């Protein structure tokens, strides 16, 4: 579970994203595709050119989905139930790749939140994205 401090830190730091959520998703996806090229094969037909609209559009949906998960932080298994079946049953995403995206979302937040990315918040965001990752890999 996530300590009431962890949730406060997740709701604090992710609230500051707000409007740029769509743009941070895109950067975290770009970061993962460049750092870990094995992940590209899940997006074979994507335009992965720097600042492609298709990646901006997908970064938008991932960001929106994480926003939803902050709002249902006590109720994630049911919030992201359709998203679980998608990643697990249809897409067959290797659990390892969730640690890769989660890490690239951490790099993106640290690079955008100088004052806001303290060790404490780092630990809370890490635990948060680990929880989302556990739910999304849950229907195996």
């Amino acid at each position: 579970v996530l300590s009431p401090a962890d949730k406060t830190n997740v709701k604090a730091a992710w609230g500051k994203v707000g409007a740029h959520a769509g743009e941070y998703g895109a950067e975290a996806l770009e970061r993962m595709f460049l750092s870990f090229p094995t992940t590209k094969t899940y997006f074979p037909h994507f335009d992965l050119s720097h600042g492609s609209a298709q990646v901006k559009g997908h970064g938008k949906k991932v960001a929106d989905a994480l926003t939803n998960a902050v709002a249902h932080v006590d109720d994630m298994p049911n919030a992201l139930s359709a998203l679980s079946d998608l990643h697990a049953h249809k897409l067959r995403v290797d659990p390892v790749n969730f640690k890769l995206l989660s890490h690239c979302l951490l790099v993106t937040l640290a690079a955008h939140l100088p004052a806001e990315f303290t060790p404490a918040v780092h630990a809370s965001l890490d635990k948060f994205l680990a929880s989302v990752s556990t739910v999304l890999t849950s229907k195996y």
Binding site: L34, F36, L106, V107, A111, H122
Partner: protein, 146 residues
Amino acid sequence: VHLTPEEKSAVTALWGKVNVDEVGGEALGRLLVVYPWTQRFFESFGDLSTPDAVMGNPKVKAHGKKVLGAFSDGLAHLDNLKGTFATLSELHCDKLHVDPENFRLLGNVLVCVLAHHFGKEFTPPVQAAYQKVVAGVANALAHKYH
């Protein structure tokens, strides 16, 4: 572990600017905070009970400095990381018995710290170059297990 001529320059340019006396401590600190089980190896180091204690700990910062020395010595020997790190491999593997997975976690926490301190300047092209270095350092440190 193959960095292209532009990857080595992006990596070198960034590293040059790293505060050699603080970044290590910041990396080791966040490892102990984010991955508590890691404190098991650093009981000799005193108070690690809260973030503030961890980052404040003089022994953490003193040790972080020696870790960043070993990363600096890896960035100047990218073509032979097995030999640069075979002394430290023996230590962590045969002496200290650290599970090699933790070398990966410290690598990624250091990538997070470089991201925190440089902001926009730590682009994916640059991150991607460093992910090859940390993966390379981890793989070389772990070689006395292979």
